[PDB]
Amino acid sequence: ETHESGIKPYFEQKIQETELKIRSKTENVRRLEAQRNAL
Amino acid sequence: LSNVNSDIYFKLKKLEKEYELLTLQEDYIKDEQ
């Protein structure tokens, strides 16, 4: 039972390195949108 | 618990495919400004 539960966070660890990218892209769209709307 | 974890494992790959198109839109509004 604990082998099957433990291999689910290690497949998801691949998605967690993508989630640090997707969360840094969303914050930078907010900076560039207030700036683009003034120009 | 094995039925609902399997739907999450497939779903989540198709949902990241979409957010790879939103990361291209952010790059070219740097060039545009």
Swiss-Prot record, chain A:
Where would you find this protein in the cell?
A: Cytoplasm; Nucleus
| PTM description | N-acetylated by NAT1.
Q: Which family does it belong to?
A: Belongs to the AAA ATPase family.
What this protein is reported to do is described as: The 26S proteasome is involved in the ATP-dependent degradation of ubiquitinated proteins. The regulatory (or ATPase) complex confers ATP dependency and substrate specificity to the 26S complex.
Q: What is annotated about its quaternary structure and interactions?
A: May form a homodimer or a heterodimer with a related family member. Interacts with OLA1, TMA17, and UBR1.
Q: What else is known?
A: Present with 4700 molecules/cell in log phase SD medium.
Name listed for the protein in its UniProt record: 26S proteasome regulatory subunit 8 homolog
Source lineage: Eukaryota, Fungi, Dikarya, Ascomycota, Saccharomycotina
Curated annotation (Swiss-Prot), chain B:
Localisation:
Cytoplasm; Nucleus
Q: How is it modified after translation?
A: N-acetylated by NAT3.
* Function according to Swiss-Prot or TrEMBL: The 26S proteasome is involved in the ATP-dependent degradation of ubiquitinated proteins. The regulatory (or ATPase) complex confers ATP dependency and substrate specificity to the 26S complex.
Similarity field: Belongs to the AAA ATPase family.
Q: How is this protein named in the record?
A: 26S proteasome regulatory subunit 6B homolog
What fragment of the full-length protein is this?
40 to 72 of 428
